[PDB]
Amino acid sequence: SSFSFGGFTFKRTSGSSIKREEEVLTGNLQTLKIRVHEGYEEFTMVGKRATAILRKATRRLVQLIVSGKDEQSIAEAIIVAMVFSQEDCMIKAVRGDLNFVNRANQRLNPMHQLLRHFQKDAKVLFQNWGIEHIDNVMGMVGVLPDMTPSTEMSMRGIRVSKM
Numbered sequence: 001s002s003f004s005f006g007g008f009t010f011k012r013t014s015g016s017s018i019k020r021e022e023e024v025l026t027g028n029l030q031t032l033k034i035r036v037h038e039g040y041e042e043f044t045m046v047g048k049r050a051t052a053i054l055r056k057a058t059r060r061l062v063q064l065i066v067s068g069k070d071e072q073s074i075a076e077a078i079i080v081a082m083v084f085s086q087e088d089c090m091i092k093a094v095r096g097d098l099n100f101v102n103r104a105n106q107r108l109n110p111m112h113q114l115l116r117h118f119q120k121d122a123k124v125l126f127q128n129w130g131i132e133h134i135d136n137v138m139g140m141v142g143v144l145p146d147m148t149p150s151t152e153m154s155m156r157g158i159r160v161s162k163m
């Protein structure tokens with residue numbers, strides 16, 4: 001399967017899923033209804049400024065390896081992937097209310113609301129995702145919550161690759 005989300009063409013390379021409508025609670029205890037894809041899947045994300053390779057289990061990002069033009073372009077893809085993954089820590093990183101009433105937001109489903117929320121500011125999302133020690137595996141660097149490259153540590157599951 002092939003589809004678009006957040007400016008990225010996703011192509012499924014492995015795995016399969018069944019979709020199911022589900023409720024989640026934000027960090028502000030707001031209920032959002034999202035369509036959850038159940039099953040382990042692997043995708044290539046093709047964007048105009050970044051490309052990535054995404055592994056996900058149900059509502060869990062397992063791994064993201066991102067290549068791109070620069071910090072912003074690569075963060076853009078990291079944010080898209082984190083939202084797409086539908087992980088609870090991404091949803092718990094929403095600390096205030098999401099506005100479904102105002103006219104400019106009527107086009108947006110909860111998934112696109114979340115995306116927009118993290119595009120405006122990814123700080124809380126990145127801080128609360130979690131961190132891990134990494135290996136010196138080559139071409140690949142870790143990236144810290146402030147998007148600084150690291151050879152020791154990285155946001156959980158996330159690697160930045162050289163072009």
Ligand SMILES: CN1CN([C@@H]2O[C@H](COP(=O)(O)OP(=O)(O)OP(=O)(O)O)[C@@H](O)[C@H]2O)c2nc(N)[nH]c(=O)c21
Pocket residue numbers: 001003004005012017034035036037041084085086109110111112
């Ligand atoms: C989390 N997602 C989302 N997604 C696909 O990404 C596209 C983006 O749409 P979406 O806004 O998440 O949901 P969608 O089903 O289209 O609309 P809605 O739920 O508002 O009725 C859709 O084609 C959707 O099927 C996915 N596709 C696969 N294969 N696996 C997944 O985990 C996911």
Ligand SMILES: O=C1c2ccc(S(=O)(=O)O)cc2C(=O)c2ccc(S(=O)(=O)O)cc21
Pocket residue numbers: 031032033034100101109110
């Ligand atoms: O808070 C929401 C809301 C929450 C979740 C979804 S859903 O995720 O599309 O099911 C959708 C919505 C809404 O569409 C909506 C419309 C009107 C109000 S109200 O004016 O605060 O009563 C709240 C909301």
Ligand SMILES: O=C1c2ccc(S(=O)(=O)O)cc2C(=O)c2ccc(S(=O)(=O)O)cc21
Pocket residue numbers: 067138139140161162163
């Ligand atoms: O094997 C790779 C490698 C393979 C594929 C890509 S890709 O272009 O992103 O697919 C990228 C890469 C790399 O960026 C890279 C960097 C450094 C080494 S090293 O000389 O063994 O240190 C190997 C590699």
